[PDB]
């Protein structure tokens, strides 16, 4: 239920390139990292909610 440091890098890496992923893309990314899609899905949302200028 808690992301490893490498996983955080990988998610943070993509978010810097893409604030908005498609459902197919979030499924693809959750497979690589071995995390639930819901987990990946929530992560991006939480991430976007922190700043106005990422919305």
PDB file of C-alpha atoms in Angstrom:
ATOM      1  CA  UNK A   1       0.000   0.000   0.000  1.00  0.00           C
ATOM      2  CA  UNK A   2       3.112   2.264   0.068  1.00  0.00           C
ATOM      3  CA  UNK A   3       5.261   3.047  -2.974  1.00  0.00           C
ATOM      4  CA  UNK A   4       8.949   2.194  -3.155  1.00  0.00           C
ATOM      5  CA  UNK A   5      11.428   4.986  -3.920  1.00  0.00           C
ATOM      6  CA  UNK A   6      12.054   3.743  -7.479  1.00  0.00           C
ATOM      7  CA  UNK A   7       8.303   3.609  -8.112  1.00  0.00           C
ATOM      8  CA  UNK A   8       7.956   7.211  -6.909  1.00  0.00           C
ATOM      9  CA  UNK A   9      10.709   8.269  -9.321  1.00  0.00           C
ATOM     10  CA  UNK A  10       8.950   6.497 -12.190  1.00  0.00           C
ATOM     11  CA  UNK A  11       5.579   8.125 -11.464  1.00  0.00           C
ATOM     12  CA  UNK A  12       7.150  11.524 -10.762  1.00  0.00           C
ATOM     13  CA  UNK A  13       9.089  11.139 -13.968  1.00  0.00           C
ATOM     14  CA  UNK A  14       5.977  10.626 -16.101  1.00  0.00           C
ATOM     15  CA  UNK A  15       3.967  13.326 -14.360  1.00  0.00           C
ATOM     16  CA  UNK A  16       6.614  15.866 -15.365  1.00  0.00           C
ATOM     17  CA  UNK A  17       5.994  14.864 -18.967  1.00  0.00           C
ATOM     18  CA  UNK A  18       2.262  14.207 -18.732  1.00  0.00           C
ATOM     19  CA  UNK A  19      -0.110  15.517 -16.090  1.00  0.00           C
ATOM     20  CA  UNK A  20      -3.067  13.786 -17.803  1.00  0.00           C
ATOM     21  CA  UNK A  21      -2.947  10.123 -18.776  1.00  0.00           C
ATOM     22  CA  UNK A  22      -5.577   8.120 -20.644  1.00  0.00           C
ATOM     23  CA  UNK A  23      -7.109   5.021 -19.025  1.00  0.00           C
ATOM     24  CA  UNK A  24      -5.155   2.754 -21.403  1.00  0.00           C
ATOM     25  CA  UNK A  25      -1.945   4.597 -20.422  1.00  0.00           C
ATOM     26  CA  UNK A  26      -2.611   4.284 -16.664  1.00  0.00           C
ATOM     27  CA  UNK A  27      -3.295   0.585 -17.084  1.00  0.00           C
ATOM     28  CA  UNK A  28      -0.031   0.181 -19.049  1.00  0.00           C
ATOM     29  CA  UNK A  29       1.919   2.112 -16.356  1.00  0.00           C
ATOM     30  CA  UNK A  30       0.336   0.171 -13.452  1.00  0.00           C
ATOM     31  CA  UNK A  31       1.509  -3.110 -15.068  1.00  0.00           C
ATOM     32  CA  UNK A  32       5.151  -1.991 -15.410  1.00  0.00           C
ATOM     33  CA  UNK A  33       5.318  -0.817 -11.796  1.00  0.00           C
ATOM     34  CA  UNK A  34       3.287  -3.683 -10.362  1.00  0.00           C
ATOM     35  CA  UNK A  35       0.758  -1.441  -8.636  1.00  0.00           C
ATOM     36  CA  UNK A  36      -3.046  -1.429  -8.827  1.00  0.00           C
ATOM     37  CA  UNK A  37      -4.600   0.809 -11.486  1.00  0.00           C
ATOM     38  CA  UNK A  38      -6.676   2.505  -8.773  1.00  0.00           C
ATOM     39  CA  UNK A  39      -3.400   3.301  -6.949  1.00  0.00           C
ATOM     40  CA  UNK A  40      -1.838   4.819 -10.054  1.00  0.00           C
ATOM     41  CA  UNK A  41      -5.137   6.544 -10.852  1.00  0.00           C
ATOM     42  CA  UNK A  42      -5.386   8.161  -7.404  1.00  0.00           C
ATOM     43  CA  UNK A  43      -1.744   9.134  -7.417  1.00  0.00           C
ATOM     44  CA  UNK A  44      -2.098  11.326 -10.532  1.00  0.00           C
ATOM     45  CA  UNK A  45      -5.277  12.918  -9.196  1.00  0.00           C
ATOM     46  CA  UNK A  46      -3.750  13.723  -5.798  1.00  0.00           C
ATOM     47  CA  UNK A  47      -0.683  15.045  -7.626  1.00  0.00           C
ATOM     48  CA  UNK A  48      -2.748  17.348  -9.877  1.00  0.00           C
ATOM     49  CA  UNK A  49      -4.751  18.644  -6.866  1.00  0.00           C
ATOM     50  CA  UNK A  50      -1.639  20.103  -5.181  1.00  0.00           C
ATOM     51  CA  UNK A  51      -1.115  22.944  -7.652  1.00  0.00           C
ATOM     52  CA  UNK A  52      -3.537  25.090  -9.641  1.00  0.00           C
ATOM     53  CA  UNK A  53      -1.165  25.303 -12.612  1.00  0.00           C
ATOM     54  CA  UNK A  54      -1.143  21.534 -13.155  1.00  0.00           C
ATOM     55  CA  UNK A  55      -4.903  21.338 -13.802  1.00  0.00           C
TER      56      UNK A  55
END
